[PDB]
Amino acid sequence: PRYELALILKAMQRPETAATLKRTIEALMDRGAIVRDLENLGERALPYRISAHSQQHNRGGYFLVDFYAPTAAVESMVEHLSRDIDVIRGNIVKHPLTQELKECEGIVPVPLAEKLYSTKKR
Amino acid sequence: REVLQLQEEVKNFITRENLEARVEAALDSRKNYNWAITREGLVVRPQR
Amino acid sequence: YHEDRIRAKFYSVYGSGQRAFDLFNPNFKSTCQRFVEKYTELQKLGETDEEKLFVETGKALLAEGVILRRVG
Amino acid sequence: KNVLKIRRRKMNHHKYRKLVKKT
Amino acid sequence: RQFSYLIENMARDCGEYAHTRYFRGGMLTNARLLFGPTVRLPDLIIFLHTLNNIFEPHVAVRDAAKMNIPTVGI
Amino acid sequence: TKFSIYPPIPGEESSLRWAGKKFEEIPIAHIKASHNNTQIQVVSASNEPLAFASCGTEGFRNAKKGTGIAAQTAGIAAAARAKQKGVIHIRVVVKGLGPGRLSAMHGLIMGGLEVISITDNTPIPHXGCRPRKARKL
Amino acid sequence: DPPPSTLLKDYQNVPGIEKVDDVVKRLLSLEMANKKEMLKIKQEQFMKKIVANPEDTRSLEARIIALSVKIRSYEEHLEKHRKDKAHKRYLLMSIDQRKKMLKNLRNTNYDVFEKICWGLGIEYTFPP
Amino acid sequence: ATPSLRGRLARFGNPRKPVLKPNKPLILANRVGERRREKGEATCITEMSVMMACWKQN
Amino acid sequence: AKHLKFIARTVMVQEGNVESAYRTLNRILTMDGLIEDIKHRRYYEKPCRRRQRESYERCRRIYNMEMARKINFLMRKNRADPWQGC
Amino acid sequence: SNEDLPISMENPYKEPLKKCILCGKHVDYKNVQLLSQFVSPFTGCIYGRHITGLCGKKQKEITKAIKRAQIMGFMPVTYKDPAYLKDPKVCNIRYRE
RNA sequence: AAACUCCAGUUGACACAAAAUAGACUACGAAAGUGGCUUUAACAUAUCUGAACACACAAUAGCUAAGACCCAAACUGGGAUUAGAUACCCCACUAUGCUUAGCCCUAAACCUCAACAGUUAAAUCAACAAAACUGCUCGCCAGAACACUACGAGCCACAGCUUAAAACUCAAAG
Numbered sequence A: 001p002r003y004e005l006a007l008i009l010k011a012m013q014r015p016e017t018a019a020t021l022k023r024t025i026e027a028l029m030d031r032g033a034i035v036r037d038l039e040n041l042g043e044r045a046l047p048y049r050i051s052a053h054s055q056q057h058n059r060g061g062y063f064l065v066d067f068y069a070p071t072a073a074v075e076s077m078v079e080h081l082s083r084d085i086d087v088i089r090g091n092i093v094k095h096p097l098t099q100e101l102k103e104c105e106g107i108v109p110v111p112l113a114e115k116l117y118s119t120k121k122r
Numbered sequence B: 001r002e003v004l005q006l007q008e009e010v011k012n013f014i015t016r017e018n019l020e021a022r023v024e025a026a027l028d029s030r031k032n033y034n035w036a037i038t039r040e041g042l043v044v045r046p047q048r
Numbered sequence C: 001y002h003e004d005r006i007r008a009k010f011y012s013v014y015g016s017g018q019r020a021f022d023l024f025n026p027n028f029k030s031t032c033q034r035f036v037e038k039y040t041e042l043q044k045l046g047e048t049d050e051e052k053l054f055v056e057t058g059k060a061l062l063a064e065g066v067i068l069r070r071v072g
Numbered sequence D: 001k002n003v004l005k006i007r008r009r010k011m012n013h014h015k016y017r018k019l020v021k022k023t
Numbered sequence E: 001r002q003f004s005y006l007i008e009n010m011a012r013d014c015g016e017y018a019h020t021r022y023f024r025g026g027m028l029t030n031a032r033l034l035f036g037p038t039v040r041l042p043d044l045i046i047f048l049h050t051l052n053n054i055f056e057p058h059v060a061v062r063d064a065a066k067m068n069i070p071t072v073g074i
Numbered sequence F: 001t002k003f004s005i006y007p008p009i010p011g012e013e014s015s016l017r018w019a020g021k022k023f024e025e026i027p028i029a030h031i032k033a034s035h036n037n038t039q040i041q042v043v044s045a046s047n048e049p050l051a052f053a054s055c056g057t058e059g060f061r062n063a064k065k066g067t068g069i070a071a072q073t074a075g076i077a078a079a080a081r082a083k084q085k086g087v088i089h090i091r092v093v094v095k096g097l098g099p100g101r102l103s104a105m106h107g108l109i110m111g112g113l114e115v116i117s118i119t120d121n122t123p124i125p126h127x128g129c130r131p132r133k134a135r136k137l
Numbered sequence G: 001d002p003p004p005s006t007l008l009k010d011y012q013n014v015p016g017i018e019k020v021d022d023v024v025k026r027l028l029s030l031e032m033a034n035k036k037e038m039l040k041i042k043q044e045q046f047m048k049k050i051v052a053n054p055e056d057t058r059s060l061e062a063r064i065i066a067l068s069v070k071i072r073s074y075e076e077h078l079e080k081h082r083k084d085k086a087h088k089r090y091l092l093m094s095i096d097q098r099k100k101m102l103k104n105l106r107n108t109n110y111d112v113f114e115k116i117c118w119g120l121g122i123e124y125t126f127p128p
Numbered sequence H: 001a002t003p004s005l006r007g008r009l010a011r012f013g014n015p016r017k018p019v020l021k022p023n024k025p026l027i028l029a030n031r032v033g034e035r036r037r038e039k040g041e042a043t044c045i046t047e048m049s050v051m052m053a054c055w056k057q058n
Numbered sequence I: 001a002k003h004l005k006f007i008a009r010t011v012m013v014q015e016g017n018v019e020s021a022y023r024t025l026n027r028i029l030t031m032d033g034l035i036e037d038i039k040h041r042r043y044y045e046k047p048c049r050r051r052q053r054e055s056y057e058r059c060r061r062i063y064n065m066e067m068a069r070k071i072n073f074l075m076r077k078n079r080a081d082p083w084q085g086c
Numbered sequence J: 001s002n003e004d005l006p007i008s009m010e011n012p013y014k015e016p017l018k019k020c021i022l023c024g025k026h027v028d029y030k031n032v033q034l035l036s037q038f039v040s041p042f043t044g045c046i047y048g049r050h051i052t053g054l055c056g057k058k059q060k061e062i063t064k065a066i067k068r069a070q071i072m073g074f075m076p077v078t079y080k081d082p083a084y085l086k087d088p089k090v091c092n093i094r095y096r097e
Numbered sequence K: 001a002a003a004c005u006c007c008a009g010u011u012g013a014c015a016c017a018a019a020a021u022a023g024a025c026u027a028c029g030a031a032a033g034u035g036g037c038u039u040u041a042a043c044a045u046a047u048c049u050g051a052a053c054a055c056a057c058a059a060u061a062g063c064u065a066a067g068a069c070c071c072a073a074a075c076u077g078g079g080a081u082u083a084g085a086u087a088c089c090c091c092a093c094u095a096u097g098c099u100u101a102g103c104c105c106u107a108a109a110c111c112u113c114a115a116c117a118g119u120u121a122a123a124u125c126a127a128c129a130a131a132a133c134u135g136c137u138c139g140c141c142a143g144a145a146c147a148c149u150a151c152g153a154g155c156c157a158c159a160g161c162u163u164a165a166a167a168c169u170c171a172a173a174g
């Protein structure tokens, strides 16, 4: 089914970032994934210092890969991303747009619970 | 209707032929998912 | 009552009338009551659309000199 | 409720485990 | 207590009796001790308000029934 | 400008200066307020030790270290040694809820140092090591 | 199991899906779906083969077929997850519920009961 | 808003396990608690320590 | 350890008013639950004892919040006696 | 008979059900700006529904999104990102009084 | 007091341990249980009832084998207290809590309130507790103590578990 790879990349120059992005997309395709879109969220300071592959990273390039892969591909891709030294953090989730929000009428008021205790005179 | 919609989207899907071109286009572009909500329930998109 | 549907719509569109309700007078008619009466009179004419009938009711009151300031 | 019924059983069981250990 | 003055006047005007004050325990069921052995109890009790000041039935409603006195009540 | 309780962000540009020094350059006074002792170390903004004083180093022994007056005495001692090395403004970082949590800062002020900010850094595990068993008192 | 290229049960009968792009076909195939989608096709195949009316799912026969597909899925899960006690309970309960269904079917309709046993390869054993 | 009491207590209708186990019935009393005296604290500790400190010096 | 220092639980002193700053900081930690959490973390509270306390603290909130709602509802009637003498 | 007798209707004056500010809006873990609005500026603690004012469904969604964003390298844990300190206040909590 | 000073504070690197806030929510599961994040698989039954033993599960403790070491900690040692202190307080450190593979099958395993269906009418109803009842079915109980015992039998259990009496004694126990 449809997935989303939130790939935080190392702070590199454009040629190395392009090579890393292509390499990662090629790995997805090799595992049977139909890559749909690639989004650049920009390079920003990490929320906290992340130590990956014996390197301390304070900045990273946030990218998103929208793709369709078979369920078995996910585990294999996770293993590939772990071995890539240019990837700071990589997570695969079920694509959020596939999940449909149920229509909400609004907040229904709940009345005070009654008849909790008998009406005997204490 | 869903098959028809899907048949149109697949035209824009990344392929090995266009992979390099799509990677360069992504590097140039910027996508923002951040927006704020007011007390009135109105979305305040970012101004940047 | 059947007219409560009219009163609810009127109160939503225009709000509480500027004229203050005098509950001491048994025959006191409010702006909303006047609207209900005109609305009912136009229902006897044979208008079948509430929205059209509601619009026509307001126009008749405006012609009679009633002040109808909508919430907007 | 008080625990007087439990207390009788508590002493019986303790003495039993002590007797079994000894013998 | 908003109508204690009104009710006490109405009773005096029609030549009857009013009890708008705190109802002491035993006014009806222990009257012969409180008032005297030859005291005559009311023949009718009209409750203009049947609830006391804690929103519970006025004690005299129960006591009137004990003494077999008919009661009118709003 | 309205006073901002929020500290100036190191990256952004701020106009707030203390003796011509930015918030990121003010020396730090690390206070460890334990249940039985208070330890104060004044370090520079580059982590160079400048002064150290505890209730133990001021001559209080056993239960007398776990008192406000003992922590206040340590604060004054640390300020004196820090003021000799050129410290005026300090960023206080207190750790722990001991008896000398507030008294230690009063001592630092009584010693001639100016506190520009107070940070609480008491360690709170988010789930961590299981603490010692409850006491039967 | 059904081939992975098999189209999903929902999209198998939409007109013109035989002529869509190959990418669209595999996106709508079993390969790109979860395990539950393949189970639906399994049930469909059994319903058509054994049941007189595939559309009727409330018959005692359709319920047996549906339960047998579930039973097989639990056995496959338990093969990978041997110490999953929750699923082991679900399998044994499901087996006991199919035995009760089969007993009722044997008592009511023997001719159809025999066809269920043949198609689903179920051997009816009498309780101890 | 007051937290809900629907399904919180162990009752015949309630199928789930009890969320709450009040040791007293959850019923408002006709009284409130009495005013509590403040815990006494030693005063003028700082001023005493300045005078005593000077005594040591002099 | 990993996060940037001097951002969390940091309060700036206004006009050298350290007392007001400490009271503010202490109020922020109390409202968030850090002060009360630290005190409970000194000794390990066993699961059964933690469940018994949460149940107690929850029943106390419900009762205290309902008593307060009645006090504010009846405070209107603290007026002077209008029918004095009746 | 008589036409003035009350008739049976659903309350016409009944007001519409209230809605939380986030009702009908997708909550995303990538939308860190929105998520930051529901955490404490000083400690980063997630605010309860009594403070945030969200409905039970949206309170759960916000919580799960924060926890996800915080561990995936999108959101800080121990404090609120200073960049989002000037966003609209939507939480009923006062720290200075 | 002992202990520690190969100690303590700042900073950096840094788990086979445990999972603040959310949670004032009351959800999931047959129960036991389940509250960090992601993904995969996945939550029986179109009438109901239906096992101390058949079948499958079952907190914590414990057993067997192989690993892990932050912290906690039976036992043990030291310090203190005390008439004594085999405890309560302080310190140190084991088994054990963790993982893998097999056992063991117990709990105030109690929300001490069985499953399913239905009712709020009347005498509501000993007391207290969490108002009083109807239909139907299975399970269980008939003074206290002996007795979570003896014997027999079964069990990977061998200081064990399950089932479970009698004699003598009492006029109470509850």
Ligand code: FES
Pocket: A104, A105, A106, A107, J018, J019, J020, J022, J023, J024, J054, J055, J056, J057, J058
């Ligand atoms: S009230 Fe609609 S989702 Fe919150």
Ligand SMILES: [K+]
Pocket: F126, F127, K019, K036
């Ligand atoms: K956690």
Ligand SMILES: [K+]
Pocket: K110
């Ligand atoms: K219990």
Ligand SMILES: [Mg+2]
Pocket: D008, D011, D012
């Ligand atoms: Mg005995």
Ligand SMILES: [Mg+2]
Pocket: H023
């Ligand atoms: Mg009790």
Ligand SMILES: [Mg+2]
Pocket: none
């Ligand atoms: Mg010594």
Ligand SMILES: [Mg+2]
Pocket: K023
């Ligand atoms: Mg909590």
Ligand SMILES: [Mg+2]
Pocket: K050
């Ligand atoms: Mg059954």
Ligand SMILES: [Mg+2]
Pocket: K051
């Ligand atoms: Mg039996």
Ligand SMILES: [Mg+2]
Pocket: K058
């Ligand atoms: Mg077990």
Ligand SMILES: [Mg+2]
Pocket: none
């Ligand atoms: Mg073990």
Ligand SMILES: [Mg+2]
Pocket: none
């Ligand atoms: Mg230890």
Ligand SMILES: [Mg+2]
Pocket: none
């Ligand atoms: Mg060990």
Ligand SMILES: [Mg+2]
Pocket: K109
């Ligand atoms: Mg339990």
Ligand SMILES: [Mg+2]
Pocket: K112
């Ligand atoms: Mg029981």
Ligand SMILES: [Mg+2]
Pocket: K114, K115, K138
């Ligand atoms: Mg049963």
